[PDB]
Write an enzyme that holds these catalytic residues in place. Sequence first.
Site, PDB file in Angstrom:
ATOM      1  N   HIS F  62       0.850  -1.287   0.019  1.00 17.29           N
ATOM      2  CA  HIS F  62      -0.018  -0.121   0.123  1.00 17.29           C
ATOM      3  C   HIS F  62       0.953   1.171  -0.223  1.00 17.29           C
ATOM      4  N   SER F 157      11.913   6.228 -13.823  1.00 14.65           N
ATOM      5  CA  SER F 157      11.249   6.940 -14.505  1.00 14.65           C
ATOM      6  C   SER F 157      11.150   8.407 -14.144  1.00 14.65           C
ATOM      7  N   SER F 158      11.348   8.653 -12.672  1.00 13.00           N
ATOM      8  CA  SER F 158      11.143  10.001 -11.939  1.00 13.00           C
ATOM      9  C   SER F 158      12.191  10.792 -12.524  1.00 13.00           C
ATOM     10  N   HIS F 241      12.751  13.047   2.762  1.00 12.44           N
ATOM     11  CA  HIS F 241      11.906  14.314   2.796  1.00 12.44           C
ATOM     12  C   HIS F 241      12.172  15.108   1.592  1.00 12.44           C
ATOM     13  N   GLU F 243      11.589  13.811  -1.140  1.00 13.20           N
ATOM     14  CA  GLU F 243      10.405  12.957  -1.787  1.00 13.20           C
ATOM     15  C   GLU F 243       9.161  13.683  -1.569  1.00 13.20           C
ATOM     16  N   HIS F 290      15.100  14.915  10.789  1.00 20.09           N
ATOM     17  CA  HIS F 290      14.165  14.868  11.514  1.00 20.09           C
ATOM     18  C   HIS F 290      13.315  13.602  11.737  1.00 20.09           C
ATOM     19  N   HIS F 291      13.651  12.644  10.581  1.00 20.69           N
ATOM     20  CA  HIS F 291      13.036  11.420  10.632  1.00 20.69           C
ATOM     21  C   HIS F 291      13.839  10.375  11.563  1.00 20.69           C
ATOM     22  N   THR F 316       5.609  27.638   3.679  1.00 22.99           N
ATOM     23  CA  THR F 316       4.217  26.965   3.363  1.00 22.99           C
ATOM     24  C   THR F 316       3.257  27.864   4.170  1.00 22.99           C
ATOM     25  N   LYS F 319       2.337  30.280   1.271  1.00 24.13           N
ATOM     26  CA  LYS F 319       1.430  29.771   0.369  1.00 24.13           C
ATOM     27  C   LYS F 319      -0.019  29.668   0.637  1.00 24.13           C
ATOM     28  N   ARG F 438       3.702   1.993  15.639  1.00 20.27           N
ATOM     29  CA  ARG F 438       3.257   1.805  14.155  1.00 20.27           C
ATOM     30  C   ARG F 438       3.829   0.165  13.598  1.00 20.27           C
TER      31      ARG F 438
HETATM   32  C1  HEA Z   1       0.166   8.407  -1.511  1.00 19.47           C
HETATM   33  C2  HEA Z   1       0.240   8.011   0.027  1.00 19.47           C
HETATM   34  C3  HEA Z   1      -0.854   7.504   0.706  1.00 19.47           C
HETATM   35  C4  HEA Z   1      -2.336   7.657   0.688  1.00 19.47           C
HETATM   36  C5  HEA Z   1      -3.186   8.496  -0.054  1.00 19.47           C
HETATM   37  C6  HEA Z   1      -2.535   6.593   1.883  1.00 19.47           C
HETATM   38  C7  HEA Z   1      -4.128   6.624   2.124  1.00 19.47           C
HETATM   39  C8  HEA Z   1      -4.866   5.455   3.032  1.00 19.47           C
HETATM   40  N1  HEA Z   1      -3.869   4.419   3.746  1.00 19.47           N
HETATM   41 FE1  HEA Z   1      -1.764   4.628   3.834  1.00 19.47          FE
HETATM   42  N2  HEA Z   1       0.168   4.653   4.229  1.00 19.47           N
HETATM   43  C9  HEA Z   1       1.236   5.275   3.325  1.00 19.47           C
HETATM   44  C10 HEA Z   1       0.588   6.165   1.889  1.00 19.47           C
HETATM   45  C11 HEA Z   1      -0.614   6.473   1.919  1.00 19.47           C
HETATM   46  N3  HEA Z   1      -1.692   6.073   2.439  1.00 19.47           N
HETATM   47  C12 HEA Z   1       2.442   5.199   3.648  1.00 19.47           C
HETATM   48  C13 HEA Z   1       3.829   5.583   3.003  1.00 19.47           C
HETATM   49  C14 HEA Z   1       2.643   4.325   4.900  1.00 19.47           C
HETATM   50  C15 HEA Z   1       3.727   3.956   5.547  1.00 19.47           C
HETATM   51  C16 HEA Z   1       3.999   2.402   5.587  1.00 19.47           C
HETATM   52  C17 HEA Z   1       5.030   2.000   6.633  1.00 19.47           C
HETATM   53  O1  HEA Z   1       5.142   2.786   7.614  1.00 19.47           O
HETATM   54  O2  HEA Z   1       5.465   0.911   6.539  1.00 19.47           O
HETATM   55  C18 HEA Z   1       1.258   4.161   5.084  1.00 19.47           C
HETATM   56  C19 HEA Z   1       0.701   3.248   6.063  1.00 19.47           C
HETATM   57  C20 HEA Z   1      -0.758   3.220   6.367  1.00 19.47           C
HETATM   58  C21 HEA Z   1      -1.241   2.836   7.505  1.00 19.47           C
HETATM   59  C22 HEA Z   1      -0.420   2.602   8.843  1.00 19.47           C
HETATM   60  C23 HEA Z   1      -0.276   1.317   8.931  1.00 19.47           C
HETATM   61  C24 HEA Z   1       0.679   0.947   9.954  1.00 19.47           C
HETATM   62  O3  HEA Z   1       1.949   1.625  10.120  1.00 19.47           O
HETATM   63  O4  HEA Z   1       0.586  -0.079  10.498  1.00 19.47           O
HETATM   64  C25 HEA Z   1      -2.759   2.733   7.586  1.00 19.47           C
HETATM   65  C26 HEA Z   1      -3.577   2.222   8.324  1.00 19.47           C
HETATM   66  O5  HEA Z   1      -4.711   2.810   8.485  1.00 19.47           O
HETATM   67  C27 HEA Z   1      -3.053   2.819   6.069  1.00 19.47           C
HETATM   68  C28 HEA Z   1      -4.267   2.920   5.326  1.00 19.47           C
HETATM   69  C29 HEA Z   1      -4.703   3.833   4.406  1.00 19.47           C
HETATM   70  C30 HEA Z   1      -6.017   4.101   4.107  1.00 19.47           C
HETATM   71  C31 HEA Z   1      -7.309   3.449   4.805  1.00 19.47           C
HETATM   72  C32 HEA Z   1      -6.029   5.180   3.224  1.00 19.47           C
HETATM   73  C33 HEA Z   1      -7.138   5.728   2.782  1.00 19.47           C
HETATM   74  O6  HEA Z   1      -7.306   7.177   2.528  1.00 19.47           O
HETATM   75  C34 HEA Z   1      -7.773   5.368   1.245  1.00 19.47           C
HETATM   76  C35 HEA Z   1      -8.778   6.219   0.624  1.00 19.47           C
HETATM   77  C36 HEA Z   1      -7.810   6.862  -0.549  1.00 19.47           C
HETATM   78  C37 HEA Z   1      -8.221   7.104  -1.915  1.00 19.47           C
HETATM   79  C38 HEA Z   1      -9.602   6.691  -1.947  1.00 19.47           C
HETATM   80  C39 HEA Z   1      -7.243   7.820  -2.745  1.00 19.47           C
HETATM   81  C40 HEA Z   1      -8.231   7.878  -4.104  1.00 19.47           C
HETATM   82  C41 HEA Z   1      -7.589   6.967  -5.128  1.00 19.47           C
HETATM   83  C42 HEA Z   1      -7.077   7.237  -6.047  1.00 19.47           C
HETATM   84  C43 HEA Z   1      -6.633   6.219  -7.226  1.00 19.47           C
HETATM   85  C44 HEA Z   1      -6.707   8.667  -6.596  1.00 19.47           C
HETATM   86  C45 HEA Z   1      -7.933   9.242  -7.625  1.00 19.47           C
HETATM   87  C46 HEA Z   1      -7.570  10.535  -8.309  1.00 19.47           C
HETATM   88  C47 HEA Z   1      -7.109  10.654  -9.628  1.00 19.47           C
HETATM   89  C48 HEA Z   1      -6.897   9.160 -10.138  1.00 19.47           C
HETATM   90  C49 HEA Z   1      -6.692  11.878  -9.759  1.00 19.47           C
HETATM   91  N4  HEA Z   1      -1.654   3.052   5.124  1.00 19.47           N
HETATM   92  C1  HEA Z   2       2.864  15.199   1.810  1.00 24.63           C
HETATM   93  C2  HEA Z   2       4.009  15.066   2.050  1.00 24.63           C
HETATM   94  C3  HEA Z   2       4.539  15.703   3.475  1.00 24.63           C
HETATM   95  C4  HEA Z   2       4.556  17.052   3.844  1.00 24.63           C
HETATM   96  C5  HEA Z   2       4.248  18.313   3.033  1.00 24.63           C
HETATM   97  C6  HEA Z   2       5.132  16.894   5.264  1.00 24.63           C
HETATM   98  C7  HEA Z   2       5.173  18.354   5.900  1.00 24.63           C
HETATM   99  C8  HEA Z   2       5.841  18.357   7.250  1.00 24.63           C
HETATM  100  N1  HEA Z   2       6.130  17.203   7.886  1.00 24.63           N
HETATM  101 FE1  HEA Z   2       6.168  15.185   7.445  1.00 24.63          FE
HETATM  102  N2  HEA Z   2       5.979  13.201   6.949  1.00 24.63           N
HETATM  103  C9  HEA Z   2       5.624  12.620   5.780  1.00 24.63           C
HETATM  104  C10 HEA Z   2       5.214  13.437   4.549  1.00 24.63           C
HETATM  105  C11 HEA Z   2       5.182  14.919   4.455  1.00 24.63           C
HETATM  106  N3  HEA Z   2       5.439  15.744   5.600  1.00 24.63           N
HETATM  107  C12 HEA Z   2       5.710  11.153   5.630  1.00 24.63           C
HETATM  108  C13 HEA Z   2       5.431  10.212   4.435  1.00 24.63           C
HETATM  109  C14 HEA Z   2       6.384  10.962   6.932  1.00 24.63           C
HETATM  110  C15 HEA Z   2       6.603   9.434   7.694  1.00 24.63           C
HETATM  111  C16 HEA Z   2       7.920   8.644   6.960  1.00 24.63           C
HETATM  112  C17 HEA Z   2       8.090   7.513   7.734  1.00 24.63           C
HETATM  113  O1  HEA Z   2       7.852   7.416   8.891  1.00 24.63           O
HETATM  114  O2  HEA Z   2       8.004   6.468   6.770  1.00 24.63           O
HETATM  115  C18 HEA Z   2       6.318  12.205   7.908  1.00 24.63           C
HETATM  116  C19 HEA Z   2       6.721  12.261   9.133  1.00 24.63           C
HETATM  117  C20 HEA Z   2       7.438  13.425   9.501  1.00 24.63           C
HETATM  118  C21 HEA Z   2       8.270  13.523  10.590  1.00 24.63           C
HETATM  119  C22 HEA Z   2       8.975  12.513  11.231  1.00 24.63           C
HETATM  120  C23 HEA Z   2       8.532  12.104  12.653  1.00 24.63           C
HETATM  121  C24 HEA Z   2       8.822  10.626  12.951  1.00 24.63           C
HETATM  122  O3  HEA Z   2       8.511   9.959  12.010  1.00 24.63           O
HETATM  123  O4  HEA Z   2       9.614  10.287  13.868  1.00 24.63           O
HETATM  124  C25 HEA Z   2       8.349  14.995  11.041  1.00 24.63           C
HETATM  125  C26 HEA Z   2       9.196  15.745  11.895  1.00 24.63           C
HETATM  126  O5  HEA Z   2       9.945  16.620  11.928  1.00 24.63           O
HETATM  127  C27 HEA Z   2       7.518  15.853   9.970  1.00 24.63           C
HETATM  128  C28 HEA Z   2       7.254  17.104  10.223  1.00 24.63           C
HETATM  129  C29 HEA Z   2       6.871  17.983   9.308  1.00 24.63           C
HETATM  130  C30 HEA Z   2       6.937  19.330   9.072  1.00 24.63           C
HETATM  131  C31 HEA Z   2       7.309  20.526  10.128  1.00 24.63           C
HETATM  132  C32 HEA Z   2       6.081  19.622   7.750  1.00 24.63           C
HETATM  133  C33 HEA Z   2       5.760  21.231   7.070  1.00 24.63           C
HETATM  134  O6  HEA Z   2       6.322  21.097   5.573  1.00 24.63           O
HETATM  135  C34 HEA Z   2       4.517  21.528   7.456  1.00 24.63           C
HETATM  136  C35 HEA Z   2       4.461  23.068   7.181  1.00 24.63           C
HETATM  137  C36 HEA Z   2       2.987  23.381   7.252  1.00 24.63           C
HETATM  138  C37 HEA Z   2       2.258  24.177   8.345  1.00 24.63           C
HETATM  139  C38 HEA Z   2       3.034  24.188   9.658  1.00 24.63           C
HETATM  140  C39 HEA Z   2       0.997  24.493   8.208  1.00 24.63           C
HETATM  141  C40 HEA Z   2       0.666  25.719   7.259  1.00 24.63           C
HETATM  142  C41 HEA Z   2       1.359  27.055   7.827  1.00 24.63           C
HETATM  143  C42 HEA Z   2       0.908  27.929   8.614  1.00 24.63           C
HETATM  144  C43 HEA Z   2      -0.639  28.067   8.604  1.00 24.63           C
HETATM  145  C44 HEA Z   2       1.439  28.937   9.016  1.00 24.63           C
HETATM  146  C45 HEA Z   2       1.536  28.800  10.752  1.00 24.63           C
HETATM  147  C46 HEA Z   2       2.170  27.729  11.320  1.00 24.63           C
HETATM  148  C47 HEA Z   2       3.005  28.046  12.172  1.00 24.63           C
HETATM  149  C48 HEA Z   2       3.281  29.320  12.822  1.00 24.63           C
HETATM  150  C49 HEA Z   2       3.823  26.832  12.819  1.00 24.63           C
HETATM  151  N4  HEA Z   2       6.784  14.776   9.352  1.00 24.63           N
HETATM  152 CU   LIG Z   3      10.644  14.957   6.511  1.00 24.92          CU
END
Ligand code: HEA
Ligand code: HEA
Ligand SMILES: [Cu+2]
Lengths: 59, 77, 47, 269, 236, 534, 50
Positions: F62, F157-158, F241, F243, F290-291, F316, F319, F438
């Site tokens: 997934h 691809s990317s 990150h 990514e 931070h990860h 952010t 924006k 998790r």
């Molecule tokens: C793209 C990223 C993405 C999205 C959208 C989702 C969406 C969902 N994910 Fe997940 N998830 C991950 C990426 C994502 N996830 C990642 C990276 C992990 C970490 C794995 C790990 O830690 O090992 C994770 C882990 C994760 C967990 C934690 C599992 C665990 O740590 O034990 C769970 C639990 O509920 C979960 C379930 C779901 C469910 C129910 C949705 C629901 O929101 C599903 C509903 C979503 C849709 C309906 C999407 C629409 C479908 C489309 C096809 C898009 C259509 C639009 C166009 C085609 C233009 N996924």
């Molecule tokens: C869509 C992709 C996406 C984006 C945009 C972000 C955005 C951010 N993420 Fe995240 N993050 C993930 C995807 C993303 N992340 C994934 C996939 C993981 C788990 C990976 C894994 O474990 O496998 C993760 C996990 C992750 C961690 C690791 C924690 C851990 O697992 O131990 C942290 C820690 O710093 C973090 C923080 C942030 C912060 C600070 C932002 C910031 O960019 C967000 C900033 C935005 C705001 C703050 C709101 C808008 C701002 C305002 C309204 C202004 C006012 C706000 C203030 C004054 C604060 N996220």
């Molecule tokens: Cu990050």
Amino acid sequence: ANKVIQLQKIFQSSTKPLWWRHPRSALYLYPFYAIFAVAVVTPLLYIPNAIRGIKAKKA
Amino acid sequence: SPLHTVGFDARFPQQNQTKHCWQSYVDYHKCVNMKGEDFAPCKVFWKTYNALCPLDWIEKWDDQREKGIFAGDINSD
Amino acid sequence: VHFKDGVYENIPFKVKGRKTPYALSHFGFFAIGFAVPFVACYVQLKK
Amino acid sequence: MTHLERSRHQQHPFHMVMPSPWPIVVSFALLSLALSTALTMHGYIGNMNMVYLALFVLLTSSILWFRDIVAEATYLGDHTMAVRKGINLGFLMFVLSEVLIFAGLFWAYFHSAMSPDVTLGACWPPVGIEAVQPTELPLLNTIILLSSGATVTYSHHALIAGNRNKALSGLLITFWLIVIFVTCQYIEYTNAAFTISDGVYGSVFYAGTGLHFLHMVMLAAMLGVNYWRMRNYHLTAGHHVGYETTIIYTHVLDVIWLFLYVVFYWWGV
Amino acid sequence: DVPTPYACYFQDSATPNQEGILELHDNIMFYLLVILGLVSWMLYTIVMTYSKNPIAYKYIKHGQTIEVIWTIFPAVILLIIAFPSFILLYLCDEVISPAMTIKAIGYQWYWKYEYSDFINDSGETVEFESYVIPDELLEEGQLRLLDTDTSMVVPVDTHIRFVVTAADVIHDFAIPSLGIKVDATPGRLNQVSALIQREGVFYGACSELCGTGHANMPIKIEAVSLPKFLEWLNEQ
Amino acid sequence: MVQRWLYSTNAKDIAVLYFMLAIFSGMAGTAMSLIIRLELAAPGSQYLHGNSQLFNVLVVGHAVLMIFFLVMPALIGGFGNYLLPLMIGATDTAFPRINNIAFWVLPMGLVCLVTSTLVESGAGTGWTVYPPLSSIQAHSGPSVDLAIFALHLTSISSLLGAINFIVTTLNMRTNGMTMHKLPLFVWSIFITAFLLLLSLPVLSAGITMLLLDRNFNTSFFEVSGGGDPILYEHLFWFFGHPEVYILIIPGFGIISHVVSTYSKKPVFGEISMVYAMASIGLLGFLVWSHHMYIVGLDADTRAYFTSATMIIAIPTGIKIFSWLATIHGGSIRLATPMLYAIAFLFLFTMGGLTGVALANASLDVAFHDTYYVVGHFHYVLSMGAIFSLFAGYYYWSPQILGLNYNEKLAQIQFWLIFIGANVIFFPMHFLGINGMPRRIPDYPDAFAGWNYVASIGSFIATLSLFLFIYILYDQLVNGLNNKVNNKSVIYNKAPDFVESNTIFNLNTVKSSSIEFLLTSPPAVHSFNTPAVQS
Amino acid sequence: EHAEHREHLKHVPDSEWPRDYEFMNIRSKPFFWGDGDKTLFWNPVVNRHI
Ligand code: HEA
Ligand code: HEA
Ligand SMILES: [Cu+2]
Ligand SMILES: CCCCCCCCCCCCCCCC(=O)OC[C@H](COP(=O)(O)OCCN)OC(=O)CCCCCCCCCCCCCCC
Ligand SMILES: CCCCCCCCCCCCCCCC(=O)OC[C@H](COP(=O)(O)OCCN)OC(=O)CCCCCCCCCCCCCCC
Ligand SMILES: [Ca+2]
Ligand SMILES: [Mg+2]
């Protein structure tokens, strides 16, 4: 040997695709198609033994 | 004794103690062959590496010392 | 190069001029997309 | 010209490439390579002939793609100034990507060296491994690579000058220089004290230098096809992108060898 | 100490570290709530006012005053919430004269605690593996996937240094009531310090993926009083 | 049809091929997410009979499916290859065959990932493929190798799409376009292509280090040998990150366009938006650790990284405030892209705020590997990428298809996915703050109530997905009929409040981008004469 | 000179090769080429360990 201008006239007056336009193009293109078909059929064919668990007998 | 330990070392102030335990082990094995006159100051490093190193690590390092495979700066001289 | 252009010429599949209904192809595509993980689960629960 | 004659042409410089099978053929060969090596790394195939076949198919498919691109470059005349600027910028981006791969390998080396592991002896190189000396064979390697750089810039400027025989001689000389580099590197690998399985030192050392090895063999193939095209009059005096691409590849790989040499030898010892 | 059903907050603290990070989380959640309320108010009144606006003010484009205002405003919010984060980080990183050290070396789907400072008969180190009680061997009352075979029992009101490493894969040593979460890489040891302020029991789990036996790997710490701990230690 | 689709060389046919593969693999990733959420409804083995290996395998399926096979192909490939040629007036992108080989190397990434799940035990490693759990002592068999080859092929691809996109939007611009006159979606795909080009090398290096450790007896990360498993953590998160900012910045490009066109006034401070996207893309590469606040970095290291990670709340925030400024004082025509843009704004602020609380080195002691981090990232991933996906689809679909979608059905699809996604991902913050770890197929039975309510809400989300795949059928077989009746919205922009309906009919398309002034489905080589601009 | 030293190192008995360390020449799995415990550029004169 400066075949460039002759090859330009050949490659611009030809209703064949751009990889068939040279006169020598069959001489590469037929055995390569055979070798390609073999090389992308065979590891696909080896998939059910992989998910079945049957490793290759060391004979 | 009521709850004594190694304490804080100014040479290793950060979170990981992996070179601290190793250096206490190497200094305990280096107090024996080189100096050998201070048996209770030798046991300071013994208590330190005992409190800091896992027993499997101490067993593997003892096995490597006895088979000569140990990578520590140990000069029997 | 010149290909045909129009309302249905932009897509790889054939929607209008068809022998089978299109709903077969449309929901079969997403249905095998949804059934790929269940086939994976069936294999891993067989083993 | 008139309007009826300008209406017989493109109205934009950019290359309308015809439909072609080499993307799907190279990608199918890439899938067959990945599947065959993942089934040969674990003994589901008895021998490596399948992986050899998939490498050959990938290579010949890429070779056919390059034959099509030199057909479009020389014979169809599609490469104008904008398309040449585009392919120059695209090769520069791909070379930046290779630079960043090597930066990841340098981060691997610097982690394993600046944080010396306690199972290694807290010393770099580890106890028991004797390092490759800087001054003996890699000194010859780095000076023949610097002379390869001097020879490609001489031969490229001789090509711009109009002199045919100086350009072909310089390009042939730098080609044999870099295959002398590949031969000296293979000799260095053949008679060496340690292996790629000999801890992290052998790991990151042979990873970095074997990556540079593979990029130098790629540069050998590129200088070979450039020499063939200059011998058979494909390159002109002002319109050449394969040669500019190969000489900027040579200088990038030379700076990469300089960093690899000074780090892995004059600091790893 | 123990997670509660339909909970929405931290577990009850038992150490200055956990109540420090709890107070820090609430101090951050303050300003996060002011900007969530601000963003949601602005969004709500904007759509409910201007979904029935016939004339769009299509010339409001640059506006430098609010641009520099909303550039320097999240900077001071982050400055406000980054003062106590620095205070808590450099406060909880200090190890000031530990009165105990126990290794918790975590093998492939179990823990092995090692009270290497102390005695069993005279001088020799104490150690025990703490397996999870299986589902078939549970007696009525014991918490599923949390109640282990033997608990790490530990004296109260004293600085403990936990030196956690692993043997096979990365296993995390996490106890959320004690506010410690430090993973176990096979290469290096990792230390943490905590002093427990009240007697009781504290459950935790391996917060890092471990293979198939990941869920059934809990950590049961029993903070007991110092005479009863000394009795247990000589009894072991 | 063998030429036009197999041997394809124009960006539009490759874009729709990208989109067909993307929604296929997104359906599969949602199926794996449904099995995860269905087993995760009650303590104890419910549907998978024990078998935690299969749960971890479905978790990586997934994860890597929805990231590297839905969001990246859809957002980057499909939308970039359809609009990045068009919105700059490029005839057809430079290197078209590299643009074809990026798509065509994707579905065998799909094939070898599916067969990695099928073979001996499946990759059960997390989407982070951390050693020594992923190495040969824990995971034997060829499954992690095929997952590594899936990541290699999608990296190919990317990266190739990134190079093709960079020289297309640099070199192949039309004659009137300065770089400061580029649209925001084009700038977004530009910055994302630079982040792909500067991130995928480090990932390919680390993953080939892992494959070499698995199969060639070398020791990059093996401790018995001197290696560090923290080196893979460093390399993967240095990719990882950037990514996630790669995944989120095309959302920042789509939402600006839809907000300016359903607000009927341009984006507030467009150069400031370009600068904030550039500042986010520059600041991504500096925050990668931070990860790994848990592994035992120095207090100065984590004190640096908490500041650098918090710093991204400023651009952010710029924006997300400029979008509210674009909406403030407009004439809001609440169609489906505007609904998805408003919901994106709100839920993305929520997810980013949980992230900014996650950015603290002292709070990540309490939150790392809990369900709080999955609350954060499923908020920002699901809303910020999928709501952007749905907004871009409902926004650009009737133009690039010529076929209008049903509008009532699309709005019930939005309301279903909005309350479904909220009902699933909002109790995850409660599970995390109470300390639920998790990647577990089973839990102590005190987490069962919030696991049950999120497992309920997953069915609402997937029912909205099934309604979307019926909306696609309705748009495909009743496009012209939905145009001719009043089931759809024909004109996205109304007359202003002085403009007659006839005066509108002479000027019906008022767009600040070239794409809407192309014909329904656009011509196979449009822009014969290059589109000029003052 | 180095070829002379490697020819001198050729005539070394099997008990006279020194202590291969813990990190040196680890075999996490046998290789799939040849027969097993031999790498690509393996020199049996110098690299003898197993
Ligand atoms: C793209 C990223 C993405 C999205 C959208 C989702 C969406 C969902 N994910 Fe997940 N998830 C991950 C990426 C994502 N996830 C990642 C990276 C992990 C970490 C794995 C790990 O830690 O090992 C994770 C882990 C994760 C967990 C934690 C599992 C665990 O740590 O034990 C769970 C639990 O509920 C979960 C379930 C779901 C469910 C129910 C949705 C629901 O929101 C599903 C509903 C979503 C849709 C309906 C999407 C629409 C479908 C489309 C096809 C898009 C259509 C639009 C166009 C085609 C233009 N996924
Ligand atoms: C869509 C992709 C996406 C984006 C945009 C972000 C955005 C951010 N993420 Fe995240 N993050 C993930 C995807 C993303 N992340 C994934 C996939 C993981 C788990 C990976 C894994 O474990 O496998 C993760 C996990 C992750 C961690 C690791 C924690 C851990 O697992 O131990 C942290 C820690 O710093 C973090 C923080 C942030 C912060 C600070 C932002 C910031 O960019 C967000 C900033 C935005 C705001 C703050 C709101 C808008 C701002 C305002 C309204 C202004 C006012 C706000 C203030 C004054 C604060 N996220
Ligand atoms: Cu990050
Ligand atoms: C599965 C059922 C097969 C039925 C075949 C029956 C044949 C009898 C004759 C019937 C008529 C001819 C059938 C051929 C035509 C056909 O259906 O195209 C066949 C193809 C697959 O072909 P295949 O290789 O599986 O065929 C094997 C034999 N040749 O389907 C599909 O792409 C299904 C695609 C589903 C729709 C996808 C929806 C997503 C599109 C969104 C695009 C919008 C982009 C916007 C954003 C960028
Ligand atoms: C910290 C405060 C900011 C919070 C974050 C920003 C809000 C985000 C959402 C914004 C939506 C509307 C923006 C577009 C409107 C627009 O574009 O307005 C355009 C007008 C044009 O002005 P002009 O014609 O005079 O000049 C034309 C030549 N430049 O500029 C303004 O009106 C300026 C308004 C000033 C606002 C000052 C705020 C003072 C209070 C600060 C907070 C105090 C808290 C106290 C608590 C008790
Ligand atoms: Ca369950
Ligand atoms: Mg973790």
